[PDB]
């Protein structure tokens, strides 16, 4: 029931668990003298899905979604508490600030005006430094090009980020975010993890049977494009090109290049523009520009 309540109502199940964690942190420590957060991992079942299939259903429920990030905004500090000083008497005052991104449930909106005046009416100053600052980030993530049905458009979503995890995001890397699909539509990302044909046991027997014959390479190079006459050694190099290298990483030094690069020139009469469609439609993942 606790598992089902976490999976269907995290707004009513996540704050008592973090209250228990803060009480356990206070009970486990006996020295004198801040909140504590939580994080999850593991299989989700039907909650783990592609962002293009992410729709208006299961709003309140927590969503695990993987993909590729496109943008990472500038780190921006925000005020959650502002302090001030009264020089007429030398006192100190403070005010707190709340919004819809600090709690999972929506609180009653309190638009607290910044104090430009005292309640008595005296002058005051901005005590910059005793007032805490919490930085936030706004990143965008869309689906991976290998799992998505390539030919369509990618759908991206926005993640609002807290102070804690602001140094673990960069564009160009495969990522898997875990958050809550709140709609004031965005996800409140609490857990980020930075990180295709199925193989049977019958296909492995066929590739193990074709591993020791010394006539395999020529017929595999000839079998990629039957609509193009000739050019056997060029597609031999194209076969060696699309399979790859080794990507050797040296110890305490720079990495070594495993990728190969091919440039093709000649008269514009042949199938150089017809070979790119074949290498785009037959590779594992390919991008043509």
């Amino acid at each position: 029931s606790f598992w089902s309540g976490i999976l269907v109502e995290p707004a009513y199940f996540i704050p008592p668990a973090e209250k228990a964690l803060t009480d356990l942190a206070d009970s486990m420590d006996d020295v004198p003298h801040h909140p504590w957060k939580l994080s999850f991992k593991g299989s989700f079942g039907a909650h783990a899905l592609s962002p293009r299939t992410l729709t208006a259903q299961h709003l309140n429920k927590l969503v695990s979604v993987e993909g590729i990030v496109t943008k990472t905004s500038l780190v921006r500090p925000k005020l959650i508490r502002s302090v001030h000083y009264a020089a007429k008497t030398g006192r100190f005052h403070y005010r707190d600030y709340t919004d819809a991104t600090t709690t999972l449930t929506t609180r009653i909106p309190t638009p607290a005006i910044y104090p430009t005046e005292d309640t008595e009416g005296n002058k005051l100053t901005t005590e910059y430094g005793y007032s805490t600052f919490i930085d936030h980030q706004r990143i965008t993530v869309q689906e991976m090009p290998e799992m998505a049905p390539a030919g369509q458009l990618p759908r991206s979503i926005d993640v609002i980020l807290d102070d804690d995890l602001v140094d673990k995001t960069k564009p160009g890397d495969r990522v898997n975010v875990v958050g809550v699909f709140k709609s004031l539509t965005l996800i409140l990302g609490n857990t980020v993890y930075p990180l295709r044909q199925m193989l049977t046991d019958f296909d492995i027997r066929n590739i193990n049977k074709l591993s020791k014959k010394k006539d395999i390479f020529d017929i595999l190079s000839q079998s990629l494009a039957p609509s193009i006459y000739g050019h056997d050694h060029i597609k031999k190099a194209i076969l060696l090109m699309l399979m790859g290298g080794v990507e050797k990483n040296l110890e305490n030094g720079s990495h070594l290049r495993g990728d190969i690069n091919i440039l093709m020139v000649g008269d514009p009469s042949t199938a150089k523009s017809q070979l790119l469609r074949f290498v785009l439609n037959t590779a594992s993942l390919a991008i043509a520009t």
Binding site: R196, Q197, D203, L220, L242, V246, S284
Partner: peptide
Amino acid sequence: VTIPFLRKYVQYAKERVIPQ
């Protein structure tokens, strides 16, 4: 030889065997 065979061939060579 065909289109769905060489894809599985290339990915199994990419994932399992590293030559020295």
